[PDB]
Amino acid sequence: MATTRVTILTGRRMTDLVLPAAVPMETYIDDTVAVLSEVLEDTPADVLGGFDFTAQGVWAFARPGSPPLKLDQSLDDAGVVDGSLLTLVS
Amino acid sequence: MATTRVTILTGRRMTDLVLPAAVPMETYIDDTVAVLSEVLEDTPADVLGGFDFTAQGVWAFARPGSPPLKLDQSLDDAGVVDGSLLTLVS
């Protein structure tokens, strides 16, 4: 399985992940959010810039400050390269 | 976020995955199965040894031939190390 290294920015915190490169983002985004919520459960809120893992609505990846990537596309389709910064948006 | 590379056995096929080592298995197993479903979607049926992605219960990881690991535990809790062989069972 091809993979890509991405770093998720949550406020000031960076978290490095290894994600499937060629599978649509919709296939794994929900459990990604769930994992990151556990990983950052003890992190102070001011450091997370108030980030809410319990936000309602449809989660997607986005390059910081940009419109969200299409969930039916893979990271490869979206041109995401190793070490790219992404955010989680809903 | 700690990770451990595991080898998932499906029939005669072995597929390496980098999984979160420190969060409960139940946090990511469902999307792991979904991802693996896409990755192995062109694998010939005889290589798959009757492995079925259609669940007969709640999915769990298991060391081949052993009782399934508890979903509330992490890979670390289960003593899983790099290149540990695991299967998916329901």
Side-chain angles (χ1 to χ4, degrees):
Chain A
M1 184 185 80
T3 53
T4 298
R5 270 56 180 182
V6 304
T7 297
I8 305 307
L9 186 56
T10 309
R12 298 209 264 289
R13 176 63 71 88
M14 290 174 177
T15 308
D16 292 358
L17 306 176
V18 181
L19 300 177
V23 174
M25 281 172 270
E26 59 198 6
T27 312
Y28 60 87
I29 186 157
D30 289 317
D31 283 4
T32 300
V33 168
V35 168
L36 285 164
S37 181
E38 298 265 351
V39 169
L40 299 172
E41 74 189 8
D42 296 335
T43 295
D46 72 310
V47 169
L48 301 178
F51 188 90
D52 186 2
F53 287 105
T54 63
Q56 302 176 265
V58 179
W59 287 105
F61 295 101
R63 285 189 186 90
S66 297
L69 308 180
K70 296 284 162 76
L71 282 160
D72 65 354
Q73 281 180 31
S74 65
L75 293 169
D76 285 339
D77 292 334
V80 178
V81 300
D82 288 321
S84 286
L85 284 197
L86 296 176
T87 59
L88 282 163
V89 297
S90 67
Chain B
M1 187 184 99
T3 68
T4 302
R5 182 184 50 94
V6 308
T7 303
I8 303 304
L9 181 63
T10 56
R12 303 261 152 166
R13 176 62 83 91
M14 279 164 184
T15 307
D16 287 4
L17 299 180
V18 175
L19 295 179
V23 317
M25 283 175 259
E26 60 197 337
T27 312
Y28 58 85
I29 192 168
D30 293 331
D31 287 358
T32 302
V33 169
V35 166
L36 282 163
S37 193
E38 277 242 25
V39 172
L40 298 176
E41 71 171 30
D42 300 310
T43 309
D46 53 352
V47 170
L48 285 186
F51 184 84
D52 185 351
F53 283 93
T54 313
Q56 311 296 299
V58 309
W59 288 108
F61 292 103
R63 294 193 167 83
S66 294
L69 305 175
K70 300 265 82 174
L71 288 155
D72 55 353
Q73 286 182 20
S74 74
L75 292 177
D76 285 347
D77 288 333
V80 169
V81 289
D82 279 324
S84 287
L85 202 62
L86 298 171
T87 63
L88 286 158
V89 302
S90 76

